[PDB]
């Protein structure tokens, strides 16, 4: 509360470490469905169903331009990419399975890096 603060967690490396995690997601062989925004003109149903589209290139631009106020807002956009994928793709599709694999990969890096 006022003038009563919990000890200061060192966040000075958070930007660089989120960038590294994002690089590892970008270079994973199963990243291909997630590299670019879904083409809303060419994928019927996507625009109406998926209210907040997100992809790795968009996260990379947000990260590079100071649009994440903290590491939690970054993890929220990563998870959005997988939640969108699960909403639109069957679990037993190439893209569906990609999304499960990448979420697992991400969550392990996240825990090992920050928790």
DSSP string, 3-53: T--------TTHHHHHHHHHHHHHHSTT-GGGSS---TTTSTTHHHH-SS-
CATH of domain 1-115: 1.20.920.10
Give the CA angle between residues 50, 54, 57 to the nearest 5°. Answer: 150
- To one decimal, the resolution in angstroms is 1.8
Give the Cα separation of 33 and 49 in Å (integer).
17
**71 Cβ contact partners less than 8 Å away, ≥ 6 residues apart:** 11, 14, 17, 18, 114
Give the Cα separation of 5 and 113 in Å (integer).
25
The full set of domain ranges for the chain reads 1-115
The tokens for 73 are 């807002």
């Amino acid at each position: 509360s006022m003038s009563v603060k919990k000890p200061k967690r060192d966040d000075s490396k958070d930007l660089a470490l989120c960038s590294m995690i994002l690089t590892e997601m970008e270079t994973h062989e199963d990243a291909w469905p997630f590299l670019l925004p879904v083409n809303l003109k060419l994928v019927p149903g996507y625009k109406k169903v998926i209210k907040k589209p997100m992809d790795f290139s968009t996260i990379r631009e947000k990260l590079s331009s100071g649009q994440y106020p903290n590491l939690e807002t970054f993890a929220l956009d990563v998870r959005l990419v997988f939640d969108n994928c699960e909403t639109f793709n069957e679990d037993d599709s190439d893209i569906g399975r990609a999304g499960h694999n990448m979420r697992k990969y991400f969550e392990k890096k996240w825990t090992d890096t920050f928790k």
